Subunit: 221 residues, 3 copies
């Protein structure tokens, strides 16, 4: 810290800790950002941060970070994805060294030779949102996979192994169970003294059809 | 490093690299922590880190980190969740600058002007556990989703696309197949010379009821 | 930066910011890396990271990082996994301090007293691949989980809650719905004037068997 004791007989120690603290400022790190656009190929995002540096004691902003490498949790493509849309919140993380042409050519080495640049940011899905703005319905006991902001449509999975595919129609396991329970309760319908091979149908045909069409209406994305 | 050559004719180089080196000390980074408590909203965790500093040559503690923003891998709520419980291990990461009132007010800026404070740690789910303590049953070939510590209940999914919902009762696809196969082997039971519409029941009704109750007992969380 | 004004009357400011600059180089940060081998216990990976720092004006290579703690997105074992194989891309992160025997012993402090060592890298799924190399089929509207590099065999899950287990055989909800629709369209087959309890069978028995065997062939991993 600057000037422990006074004006202009500034200790040599002060003016050295001053350069160390200045260079410690200069390093980038984590910070939140709002997505502006998502590239059609789905790996680079036009990220508007949420941090401004300190300039003229006042808010200025650095430019919108462009062609920021979006980073889903995938190993060789095999992994999980989240549909990124404009207005979402990501976390910007700088690189030790730029990786310009490790991305432009794959053969991995950047342009000149530095450290920790602002043009070195990657966007990650965990670490961005604010505590003020609340995400509703945070399941606390069971693994939850969310397909909507409210987490009211997706997959729920229990320590015992219980499952829930809570889609639009309802609990898919339950609806299939309803179908098969009507089978295990079903009673064929007889029409006449007709012993030749004609016109027998299950008494509960309509509900079976209804559930059968429901499973496709909740199944064909 | 301090004192490359000796006592008190310490080179101006030594007493400058020592300052840069202490300021390099002072920065925080990634380190494991144990969850102490989890807020009801499910976003802030009381974390006791597992990194301790060095002080008076001796183990001392900096306090249990409080209202550490828990950060699941969600984007707009749409993502994956893990049920955080008191005793699990997270990885704590500091931020370049603090977000006091970026979390207290959403409008994004903290109090005075620092870098890299210990009060800037976010907790992430990956990066905390120790290699001594072994996580059993690490599926190596198929993408595995777990709902238990032993990884014996959940969703297993193969490169070919094979699926397994290994719940309490067993492979749900197998149990649904054990239902469909009994229908495809089914043989209706005829009662009397009764050609009016009465008392026809599927011969394998009891087992279809059994599988039907199984699918709800493994489906209604 | 070095020498703002010239040869050998180098300002005291220059030869101090140069020390700060060098010590700012020395710190490690992220970098992409290639998996070489994966330990049988499934938590440590032999990694050949794709970065060389600058040596003798030229590529030299810092050696294959060993017993690098692999870090899946789990807490207590409960979480998601990706099958790590030799040749995939991870991102590395060093810590503020090494954790030698917080992994050798789980009691939590490494050997001497440092900061920020090369020997302290955790490997993480997200952040490693190059933008040149394209990961195909990035589902951009629905939560997608993959079991193959092409993202063509896995599970898709929509904001409305629609589901798709696109396995080798096809949409599992579609195939189960095909089964239920043929039951709800089925019409028992009569054999003779046989009113005693014999030989009645489903009219569409063969297709019901086909679907029933399909679900096991897509279900038993």
């Amino acid at each position: 810290m600057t000037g422990y004791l006074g004006k202009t007989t500034n200790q040599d120690r002060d003016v050295v800790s001053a350069v160390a603290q200045s260079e410690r400022e200069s390093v980038w790190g984590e910070m939140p950002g709002r997505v502006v656009s998502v590239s059609a190929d789905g790996r680079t995002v036009t990220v508007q941060p949420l941090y401004k540096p300190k300039f003229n004691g006042v808010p200025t902003d650095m430019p919108v970070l462009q062609e920021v490498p979006l980073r889903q949790a995938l190993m060789g493509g095999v992994g999980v994805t989240v549909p990124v849309k404009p207005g979402q919140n990501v976390t910007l993380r700088p690189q030790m060294r730029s990786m310009d042409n490790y991305h432009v050519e794959g053969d991995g080495s950047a342009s000149d030779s530095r450290s920790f640049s602002l043009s070195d940011m990657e966007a990650h899905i965990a670490g961005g949102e604010s505590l003020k703005d609340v995400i509703p319905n945070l399941d606390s006991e069971n693994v939850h996979v969310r397909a909507n902001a409210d987490g009211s449509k997706g997959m729920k999975l229990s320590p015992e192994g219980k499952v829930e595919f809570q889609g639009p129609e309802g609990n898919l396991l339950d609806l299939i169970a309803d179908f098969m329970e009507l089978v295990a309760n079903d009673k064929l319908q007889i029409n006449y003294g007709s012993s030749a091979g004609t016109n027998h149908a299950m008494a509960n045909k309509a509900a079976m059809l209804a559930l059968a069409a429901k499973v496709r209406t909740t199944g064909t994305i």
